[PDB]
Amino acid sequence: MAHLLHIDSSISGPASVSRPLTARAAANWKAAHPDGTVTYRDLGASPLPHINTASALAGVTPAAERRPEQSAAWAVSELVVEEVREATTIILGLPLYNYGPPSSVKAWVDYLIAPGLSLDAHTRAPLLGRRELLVLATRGGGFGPGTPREGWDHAQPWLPHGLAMTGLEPEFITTELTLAPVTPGMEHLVPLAKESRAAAERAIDQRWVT
Ligand X SMILES: Cc1cc2nc3c(=O)[nH]c(=O)nc-3n(C[C@H](O)[C@H](O)[C@H](O)COP(=O)(O)O)c2cc1C
Interface residue list for ligand X (CB under 6 A):
10, 12, 15-19, 93, 95-99, 138-141, 178-179
Q: Is 138 assigned a ligand-binding role in the annotation? A: yes
Q: Using the minimum distance from each CB to ligand X, give the nearer residue, 39 or 156.
A: 156
Residues 14-53 that bind a second copy (CB under 8 A): 15, 42-47, 49-53
SS3 of residue 7 by DSSP: strand
151 binds, among ligand X, a second copy, none (CB under 5 to 8 A by kind): a second copy
Of the candidate residues 27, 31, 57, 121, the single one contacting a second copy (CB under 8 A): 57
Q: Tell me the residue type at 103.
A: S
Least Å distance, CB 11 to ligand X, is 6
Do the annotations mark residue 97 as ligand-binding?
Answer: yes
Of 108, 103, 89, 95, nearest to 41 by C-alpha is: 108
Q: Which of 73, 163, 86, 84 is nearest to 126 (CA)?
A: 163
For residues 95 and 114, give the distance between their C-alpha atoms in angstroms, rounded to a whole number. 25
* SS3 category, 4: strand
Strand-pairing partners, residue 93, are: 136
Tell whether residue 98 is among the known ligand binding residues: yes
Residue 17 interacting partner from a second copy, ligand X, none (CB closer than 5 to 8 Å by kind): ligand X
Neighbours of 64 (CB within 10 A): 5
10 assigned binding-site residue: yes
Amino acid found at 129: G
**139 known member of a binding site:** yes
Applying CB under 8 A, the residues found at the interface with a second copy are 10-13, 15, 42-47, 49-57, 97-104, 106-107, 109-110, 113, 151-152, 154, 157-158, 161-162, 164
